[model samples]
Target: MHSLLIAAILGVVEGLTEFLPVSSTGHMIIVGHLLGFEGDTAKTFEVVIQLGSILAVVVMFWRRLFGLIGIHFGRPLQHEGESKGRLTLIHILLGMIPAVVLGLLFHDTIKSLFNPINVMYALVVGGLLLIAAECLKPKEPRAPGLDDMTYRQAFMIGCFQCLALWPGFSRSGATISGGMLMGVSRYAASEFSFLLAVPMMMGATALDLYKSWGFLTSGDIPMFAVGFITAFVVALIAIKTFLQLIKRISFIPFAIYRFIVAAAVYVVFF
Candidate 1:
């Protein structure tokens, strides 16, 4: 029962932070420590709940996601060069290259940097970058739909995504800032950031789950189920609400929140 309660608490933490510009992994590490939840089992539980968050994205964007891979519902997407621009699965993969390659090359190094101190520093630095991006972004909102984004812009966002390879840097924060700096509007950048996350996260989470598979047991199923379901429901709400709220509020508020969290982490952990 205690484990189930902890699972629910961590589930809320994971769901709320995963899609936001705040770092969910960083939060989990900190919160899990405070809750006395850390180990092979805990790590595996996180991987499970992360899948719940990823599935939220899959549900939220299923239409465009399907269309990107040549699947369609009613009124097929206009072919490229026929009307508006196009966004295919290849484009998504193109935006994933830098992070994927860098993540592969530095997997071990990245794993080593997951401690709380490093996460706190990363949160501070990432928060500053968010502020800079907001200030330097194009004055007028370009407001391009995902279909209208260019290869150059997508690749630029991909490059910035490399910043998120560090544990607390926040993939959404990095990519959204990168997207804004590259002339995409806030909403478009955020949408693209989210779309880009699906495959990227799935691959990483699957690998982690594979590594930790040996740690699981029949007894842990109830805990995993509770975390998974809670994360799924909460993340569904978070993603939807964030998209609605981002346009008016922007990234600065989240950046400010990051700084406060960073300072709190420093006080408590360091």
Candidate 2:
């Protein structure tokens, strides 16, 4: 019963923080420790609930995804050079490659390294990087459409995403910053990063579920359902809120939040 309650709490946490530049995994890790969630179960729960947040992204972007598919593999249009949607799809795939490779190769090692200390370190470092990125705004913003982004730019963004392998470095945060540094506008960089997260988050969730299936009992199914539904609803709200927030605010507020949270976690846990 206690575990179930904690699962629900963690699910909400995951939903709310998943899309924000502040790290969802870092929040879950810190919260799990506070709630006495231990070992692989805690880690597995953290990854699996990401499915809820990913589902939110899918639903919110369903039209865009469908358009991309239609443009890419569907019937030919009457007039066009190349579909912008198709090009966007290609760039997203290119941007996902590095994380996919790293995730497949070091899944176990990465999970094992998730601890309070490492979480704090990642939080601090990631926070600082975000602040620095904000301060170093490019002189000329890159207005390149997703379809127009060069493969080299896509690959560089993918490499930057690999930084998110650490729990506290947000995948969206890193990728967006990378895109911005390479000349993309803030909104364009954020939108591209959000689209790229579909593959990355789905892959992580699938792999974690596959590995953790053996540990789940029939009794746990209801709890999983509760957690999943709660996460989905909360994530929808988060997505809506974030889309508005980013238009008004830079990433500095989130960066400061991360720094404060990390310092508190270190002081308490250490």
Candidate 3:
């Protein structure tokens, strides 16, 4: 029962913080430790449940994704010339290449390094990177839409995204900061980051399922479903809310939040 409760709470945390510049995995590990859950099982649970949140992005962005596919196949579509949808799709794939290679190569090594001490270091390091990126403030005028993004810029953002393989260095956070540094507006950067997450999270979840296939049981299936559905619902809400919030606020607040959380974890757990 306690394990189930921890699963639900971590599921909610994963859904809520996964897309924010805040590190969802870092938060989950801290929460798990607090709940007295230990070992690789808890880590795998946090990683696996991310599939639910990834599905939420799929549900929310299905239309945009279909439009990209239609463009790739030369289907008649509204705003075809302006869309650049095909190129955007290619850029997303290109951006994923580095992480895909790195993840596959270092999956176990990365998972083994997930101690609370490392989480603190990641939080501090990632927090500073975010703060510094915000401070850099590129002078290039903000592009009005994701379609305007260039291939080189997208690849550069992808390189920055590799930092997220570390537990506290958030994937969304790194991508968004990279986008902003490359002259995308805050909201546009964040939106692109969210879109990019579809493939990234899907790949991660697939890898997790492959590694843990036999551990799942009949009773575990229902609990997984419950956690998955709950994550999806909460994530849809989180996505909408985050998009709205970023338009009016800077990333500083999130940077501060990461610092506080990391500091608390350090004091309490370290």
Candidate 4:
């Protein structure tokens, strides 16, 4: 029963990093190295419990999601809300192409990249990728926010999503950075990243559970219970505050922090 707490603790760490542009895997690796925890059970546990975070994101926008599926009605379609919602879904599907195709084609190869050493390398490189993105942002920003996101732009961002196939490359970081480069506002980019995560993570988690579920054992029931509930509640809290926090703060601090963590992990390991 006491060992169950480690799963909860790790779930807390995942909540802290899950929604951010920072890679949760990178943090999990660091947490594992510093705290001495890793193995097939741990890996399977983390992946399984991650569903909590995915659902939390979905819950955050449940109303909007319901509306998309046709719930809130009896009012005029203000803000092109209906059309825009449809367009958004279309583009999000567009954004999923690379991941779906590439992931299906190279499943083992991609999953094999999930390791501490590779994640450390990916962490540093992803940090550099963010910095490069900010520096190379177009001089006179012409990209509009998510309201006006184009199909072409979404496709371009999908190409960038492929980078996140690396363990530490970060789905949010890759997509947001890609959107920003496509001239979208930081808010839109960040929000779009959040929006995109719904289908992506949910689908991925469903598949993961369906395939590799044998790792789960009777002993893990308590741990998974603790971890899943903990992750869900914490992810709810994080998602509530994250968008507001990003409004004031830029991504530079996060990128720099990634650099420090990556370098520190490298030094510690080597």
Candidate 5:
């Protein structure tokens, strides 16, 4: 029962923070510490359940995602997702390259940097960048759609995404802020950020699991299932809400929230 409750709590934490500029991994560290759940098993649980949130992205954008997948398998597209085999998946893979190489080459060093204190600093810095990014975005908001976003632009955003490896430097925060700085509209930037996350996170989870599955004991099954299912269901609702709310407002407000959380974490904790 106790483990079940912790799973539910993490599920809520993940569902709430996974997509927001608020850094899901950071929150899990914060809350998981308070709950006495920080350790190796918890780390595996963290990345494993994260896939549940990415699953939400798959659900939320199934149609377009399907179209992209279809194009990958040689299906003709009525619109977008190609430049006659010169692009498509190659573009996304290119965007993912810097992070993948850097992450694998320095995985241990990066993993060691996951404590709460480091994350708090990252949150504050990221919040400042987010606020500043708003000023850089054009007033007319004519940034290209996903179909129009170029591989170069996607690569730029992926470079920005590397900042997110720094815990509270929120993946969404970096990519969205980066995309906006590159002249993509908030909605387009955000949508692309969401789209980019699916592949990146899926690969991340698989790699993490491959390394960590050896640590999972038989008794861990219930905990894993509870965490996975709960996060998936809650994420569906949270992601739908984000898509709707973002369609209607600026992402600047999220920066304010990020600052408050960072300051609160610093003051209230260490």
Candidate 6:
């Protein structure tokens, strides 16, 4: 299809930004609008492609994912602080509770914030939130790794996760910042963010695809196929590289980039 190129570009954006603190929704909206790819079908395409990125996380962290449920292939992979009560299923549930509850309560209301202008505003606000989180990071991380986290800290992170209900606020950005503010190391927070991304995004993406099922057509096959593969490949790299980068760099660079992106989107769209 003529839009295959658009699909590819958007796929790259999704993979590149999905794992990053920079909001994928923010990037897709701006790029999608510029590519004249705005409509119900376009929305459908976006939702479906996210699963590809989700799959990347699944592949990268397959061990921990299965291990959380007490499954192991052979010698268990070593997670830090495993002796101090390893990260469990309860931790994930604790981290997800606030967003799940708030999302259900304000499901319809949040739809109103999906517009470009509102997303732009959220980008700015979310960036400021990240800056604040970085400024407030604890002198010594209380939870330096996933296994070192506590239920209270996970719940607190969930509370901050609610901020991401605002579309462009970004799920990873919110959770990672929340984790840091709660005294989690950047690496651990980022890891937890990636782990939390799987279940949360799976639910959201599956629900959206079901609602938009009829919008998909045979003609969409090529675009969707290419986009899906591109997203999977790109996200695999992004996830690994991001984890490394988080250790060396602070969140400030991402916060500044969000401001620049918001400004550029505003100049072009508004």
Which parts of model 1 are misplaced by more than 4 Å?
A: 77-83
Clashes of 6: 0
Indicate the residue-level lDDT of 43 in model 5. Answer: 92
Clashes of each: 0, 1, 0, 1, 0, 0
**What is every candidate's alpha-carbon RMSD to the true fold?**
2.2, 3.5, 2.8, 2.7, 3.1, 1.2
* Per-residue alpha-carbon lDDT of candidate 4 for residues 67-122, written as tens digits (9 for 90 to 100): 55557666543342213433446787788898889989999899888766788877
On lDDT, the leading prediction is 6
lDDT tens per residue, model 1, 1-270: 799999999999989999899888778887887999888789899989998888899998888789988889987754423226787776788789999999999999999998888999889899999999999988865545667688888899999999999989999999998998988888888889989999898998889888878988999999999999999999999999998898688899999999988877777677
TM-score for all models, in order of appearance: 0.95, 0.87, 0.89, 0.89, 0.89, 0.97
* Better lDDT candidate (1, 5): 1
Alpha-carbon shift of residue 260 in model 2 (angstroms): 0.9
Kindly report which residue stretches of model 6 are placed more than 4 angstroms away from their true locations once superposed: none
**TM-score for model 3?**
0.89
Number of the top candidate by TM-score? Answer: 6
Higher-TM-score candidate among 2 and 6? 6
The lDDT for every candidate, in the order shown, is 0.87, 0.76, 0.77, 0.77, 0.79, 0.90
The positional error of residue 11 in candidate 5, measured at the CA in angstroms, is 0.5
lDDT of 6 by residue, 118-191 (tens): 88888898999899999999899988888999999889998899999998998999999999999899999988
Per residue, candidate 3 scores C-alpha lDDT tens digits across 1-270 of 765676687778889989988998788777777777666556556666788888888887776666655533355433422335433577787678877788879988888767788887777788888898889968763454576677876787888888998877889888888888887777777777888898888877777777877667666665576667767778899998998898798899898899888887787786
